[PDB]
Amino acid sequence: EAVAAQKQEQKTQNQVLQLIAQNWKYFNGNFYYFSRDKKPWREAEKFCTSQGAHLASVTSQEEQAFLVQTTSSGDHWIGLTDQGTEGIWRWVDGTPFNNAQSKGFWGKNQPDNWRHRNGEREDCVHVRQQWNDMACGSSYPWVCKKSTGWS
Amino acid sequence: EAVAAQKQEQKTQNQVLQLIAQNWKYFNGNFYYFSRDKKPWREAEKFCTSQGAHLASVTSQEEQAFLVQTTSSGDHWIGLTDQGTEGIWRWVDGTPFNNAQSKGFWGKNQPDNWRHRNGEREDCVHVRQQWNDMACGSSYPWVCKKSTGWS
Amino acid sequence: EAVAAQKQEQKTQNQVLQLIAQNWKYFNGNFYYFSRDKKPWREAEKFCTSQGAHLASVTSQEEQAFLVQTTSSGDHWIGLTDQGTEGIWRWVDGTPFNNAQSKGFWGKNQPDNWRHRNGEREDCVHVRQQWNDMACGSSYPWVCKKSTGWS
Amino acid sequence: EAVAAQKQEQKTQNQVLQLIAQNWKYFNGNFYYFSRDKKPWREAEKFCTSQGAHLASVTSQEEQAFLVQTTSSGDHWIGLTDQGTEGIWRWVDGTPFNNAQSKGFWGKNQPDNWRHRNGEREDCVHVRQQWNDMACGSSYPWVCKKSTGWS
Amino acid sequence: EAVAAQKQEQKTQNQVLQLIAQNWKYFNGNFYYFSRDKKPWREAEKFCTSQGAHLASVTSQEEQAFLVQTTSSGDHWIGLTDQGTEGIWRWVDGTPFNNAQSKGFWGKNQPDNWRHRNGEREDCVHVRQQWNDMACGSSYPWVCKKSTGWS
Amino acid sequence: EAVAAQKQEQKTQNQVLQLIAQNWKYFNGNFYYFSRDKKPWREAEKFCTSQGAHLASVTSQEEQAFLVQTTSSGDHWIGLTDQGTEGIWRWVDGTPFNNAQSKGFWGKNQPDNWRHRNGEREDCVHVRQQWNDMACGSSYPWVCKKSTGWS
Ligand SMILES: [Ca+2]
Ligand SMILES: [Ca+2]
Ligand SMILES: [Ca+2]
Ligand SMILES: [Ca+2]
Ligand SMILES: [Ca+2]
Ligand SMILES: [Ca+2]
Ligand SMILES: [Ca+2]
Ligand SMILES: [Ca+2]
Ligand SMILES: [Ca+2]
Ligand SMILES: [Ca+2]
Ligand SMILES: [Ca+2]
Ligand SMILES: [Ca+2]
């Protein structure tokens, strides 16, 4: 009859306070953080990791709407990249990426892997209203994603 | 021409040095860290998060072997739990499971969800040679897993 | 001018990361791998070959110290055997050997070529603190050795 | 332009490979080596010097935890000693000590400067779980510490 | 009595079948594989290692004849290279080489260390009728060598 | 009684003989070595390490006089460098320095971080009569410093 479940849930109940108290927004199972600073892609991921998150992914399409309409009028990094090999893309969190449906989320003609002035290709993806591969060294803001068993 | 890919690599290169320099061991795409201290399940996860990792998962069975022979004669936390709801288990990183082999790796009669004296059920999993659900407040060592596009 | 090299170096520099990332230890020019599993002598060699190595040899005596103190309290296969002809021993990597120097490394009364209960002689050598010829079918751990032009 | 920094970074990037390839472990700025052999205090220091290091020091307390939990259940020399004059201790690397701190790391009643059977006092410090001054001629293992501008 | 030598021989007897079944040719103690594809020097070596071999060496001169007349009208990598230091050559398998009988095996004016159009020197050796150092990035076929106690 | 302190002192007494026998000069607690050859900054440091020393530092100003008048009419490396980040200087031995101090020891307009012809900045310091940051690849002589509990 000694139910310490109150304490267990209390611990989770507290964890989400720290998140929303730091302006993490909840959406369909995950917590998302839209950054206020702008940093490179690698530097952006080091942040999401420090906060136990990764650069957001897209398991669905309505998820992209949440981002886009939250980042409409804004370029925000995400967790896609084809560094290791120029051909294959892959999410940094672990999600395998359904190349099939991943179409439409790219710009009308994208990815292009454009050659930038400072001798860089494009191996990192950001979002304004559809994805665009970009030079990773460029300092954009970003969005982290975090999973929870909380609803 | 002017290819900073040398600079791009060099950076990833460096990232892996920091890992193995802190005794992260590589195995089939991911890096694993076997802790030297012992802490509760959440405290163990707060650590793996701090290092941009999560408590190891099992996408395969040969993966579990790697753990076992590195954790043989040792109980190590992992990222499984049926906390949110007592029935459903789920990995903390995101990996879906449930046959999904998800079997044989448990003890001969496990999980049992035993009722501990002070004063909790069992909602966290560790490994000695096969999984066992355990009271989360208990301070065991753990194993983190980290993804890379490096091989 | 245009000096790749780096790309060269970069390439060699990467090769050693994969090794130590898989827990290969460096010693006086060579890389050594001390196994975590236990397998027969041939199965141990099939592994060392797959990883571009062979079961360690002894060009020197200080080398044996490195092994012994790394495998102290442990029986580890090595690349010696007199299978082809029961009299002559020979290293599997290619190194020619001199029983002259190879003496002292054997037990006080060794090799013995003992007859085991199963119809095997002893044609394979392992180490605890000094060599002992052993039945090859027996599943001991092992040590591989790998050469490099890296220091 | 023509920037050899790569080459400069490649040089350092190589230096750390040589270290971890020989089982130097990184911790909060420094590299630490936990020996596999056991030797006297001076002989232990002659080694750390040969490898451009000195017998580990303790600028902090979290450092001692790193040592202790890597040497837990193990006696390891360190770079403290009161030879020159029996009263004052001093680190061999150069680090100044004698804080109101530096206490608590000792046994319940330590240092004692015990008189050993082979006419030796105790002028050297080792660690099992807290410091103890010891006869320097005694052959313990040791830990070296090395500094770097690498993180 | 119970003589498992039949099984021991059968295993060796089987090992050579897999080799010649894959077109490994025997010569004076060793097995040699002449590749059907063409790959760089490093890519070529990863193959020979995977197959428990190394890029062929020359312990003798009649060995070179076997290679040359098996590859007459063909450029084949071999296990020589002066990568580590531009001056010293060394075999990748381990064989030390007198570097005094080595003369005669080189082209009439070789090695030259020619500067190629792409920013590479020549640090790898192939054979047409006598050795020539070559740019390692160049995609030639190759020959592996494997040792055995079989005759 | 049986006081092996004679043997203990004799060992230290021997260490200093080896030093001055190799022309190490004593000054206010430390031993200094002024090299007879000239080598790069890194090559110079590898030496001081081999001799259980590091490139000299300056805890005081009267110390600098000893160096300057011992190296007057001579450029000698020291253990300062602003590698890692172009801004911060730091001693290679470990000494934190009186950045508030450390002025006056530099040239009238120094450091300058001049851009050298072979694409190098200046990240290493030598001394003629006052400090000057210099290209590390340049081969100057040097001075090592060594600590002792001997006076
Ligand atoms: Ca790309
Ligand atoms: Ca683009
Ligand atoms: Ca449960
Ligand atoms: Ca249980
Ligand atoms: Ca035998
Ligand atoms: Ca035997
Ligand atoms: Ca004392
Ligand atoms: Ca004592
Ligand atoms: Ca060459
Ligand atoms: Ca040529
Ligand atoms: Ca500088
Ligand atoms: Ca200057």
Q: Which ligand is located closest to the Cα atom of residue E112?
A: 10
Residue with token string 């790309």? C7
Pairing of strands E90-91, E76-81: antiparallel
Q: Do B94 and A147 touch (CB under 8 A)?
A: yes
CATH number (domain holding residue D64)? 3.10.100.10
What three-state secondary structure class fits A67?
helix
CA-to-CA distance for C80 and C88, rounded, in angstroms? 10
> Do the beta carbons of residue D131 and residue D125 sit within 8 Å?
yes
Q: For residue D122, how far is its CA from the centre of ligand 7 (angstroms)? A: 5
CA-to-CA distance for F121 and F137, rounded, in angstroms? 10
Query: Min CA distance, C92 vs chain E (Å)?
Result: 7
User: Contacts of residue C123 in chain E, CB cutoff 8 Å?
Assistant: 8
CA-to-CA distance for A25 and A41, rounded, in angstroms? 21
Pairing of strands A76-81, A90-91: antiparallel
Q: From the CA atom positions of chain A, what is the Rg in Å? A: 17
How many residues can be counted in chain B? 151
- Which range of residues forms the domain containing residue D97? 1-151
* Closest residue in C to E55 (Cα–Cα): C52
CA-to-CA distance for E21 and A25, rounded, in angstroms? 63
> Do the beta carbons of residue B89 and residue B97 sit within 8 Å?
yes
Element (H, E) at E5: helix E5-21
DSSP codes joined into one string, F5-33: HHHHHHHHHHHHHHHHHTTPEEETTEEEE
CA-to-CA distance for F135 and C52, rounded, in angstroms? 41
DSSP code at position F99: T
Residue among D79, D71, D72 nearest D145 (CA): D79
CA-to-CA distance for B40 and B142, rounded, in angstroms? 9
CA-to-CA distance for B110 and B59, rounded, in angstroms? 20
For chain E, the distance separating the N- and C-terminal CA atoms, rounded to the nearest angstrom, is: 26
CA angle, F17 then F21 then F23, to 5°: 120
Residue D144 touches chain F, beta carbons under 8 Å: no
How many residues can be counted in chain F? 151
> Do the beta carbons of residue A42 and residue A89 sit within 8 Å?
no
What three-state secondary structure class fits B20?
helix
DSSP code at position E40: -
| Burial annotation E102-141 (CB, 10 A radius, 16+ → b, else e) | eeebeeeebbeeeeeeeebbbbbbbbeeebbbbbbbbebb
Do chains F and E meet with 3 or more Cβ pairs nearer than 8 Å? no
- Give Cβ neighbours of residue B139 (< 8 Å, ≥ 6 apart): B38, B39, B40, B43
CA-to-CA distance for C42 and C53, rounded, in angstroms? 13
Give the C-alpha distances (Å, rounded to integers) separating F115 from B47, D92, E131. Answer: 44, 39, 44
Q: Which ligand is located closest to the Cα atom of residue F86?
A: 11
Q: Which residues pair with E34 in a beta bridge?
A: E143
Domain count, chain C: 1
Q: Which residues pair with C143 in a beta bridge?
A: C34
Count how many pairs of residues, chain A against chain B, have C-beta atoms within 8 Å.
61
> Do the beta carbons of residue E67 and residue E127 sit within 8 Å?
yes
Give the C-alpha distances (Å, rounded to integers) separating F105 from F31, F45, F81, F96, F108. Answer: 21, 21, 15, 16, 9
Could you tell me how far CA D119 lies from the centroid of its own chain? 26
Alpha helices in chain B (DSSP H): 5-21, 41-50, 61-71
Which tokens hold the place of D22?
């020989």
- Give Cβ neighbours of residue B134 (< 8 Å, ≥ 6 apart): B41, B122, B124, B125, B126, B140
CA atoms within 13 Å, Cβ hemisphere of E71: 29
Helix C41-50, helix E41-50: angle, nearest 10:
170
CA-to-CA distance for D123 and D117, rounded, in angstroms? 15
CA-to-CA distance for F94 and F49, rounded, in angstroms? 13
Residue C43 touches chain E, beta carbons under 8 Å: no
Q: Which residues pair with B151 in a beta bridge?
A: none
User: Contacts of residue C20 in chain B, CB cutoff 8 Å?
Assistant: 20
Q: Which residues pair with C131 in a beta bridge?
A: C106, C127
Side by side, the strands of the sheet bearing E30-34 are E25-27, E30-34, E143-147, E54-55
- DSSP E strands in A18-130: the ranges are 25-27, 30-34, 54-55, 76-81, 90-91, 124-127
Residue with token string 């190759």? E142
- Give Cβ neighbours of residue E54 (< 8 Å, ≥ 6 apart): E45, E48, E79, E91, E92, E93, E94, E144, E145, E146
Cis peptide before B119 (omega within 30 of 0): yes
> Do the beta carbons of residue A34 and residue A128 sit within 8 Å?
no
CA-to-CA distance for C125 and F101, rounded, in angstroms? 64
Q: Residue A86 carries which side chain, given as an amino acid letter?
A: E
Query: Min CA distance, D5 vs chain B (Å)?
Result: 10
Query: Min CA distance, A21 vs chain B (Å)?
Result: 18
DSSP code at position B71: H
Residue B55 touches chain A, beta carbons under 8 Å: no
What experiment produced this structure? Answer: X-ray
Could you tell me how far CA C20 lies from the centroid of its own chain? 17
Choose, out of D16, D18, D70, the residue to mutate when testing the contact with B (most B CBs < 10 Å): D16
> Do the beta carbons of residue F148 and residue F31 sit within 8 Å?
yes
Residue B34 touches chain C, beta carbons under 8 Å: no
Which tokens hold the place of B112?
């049992």
Query: Min CA distance, D149 vs chain F (Å)?
Result: 6
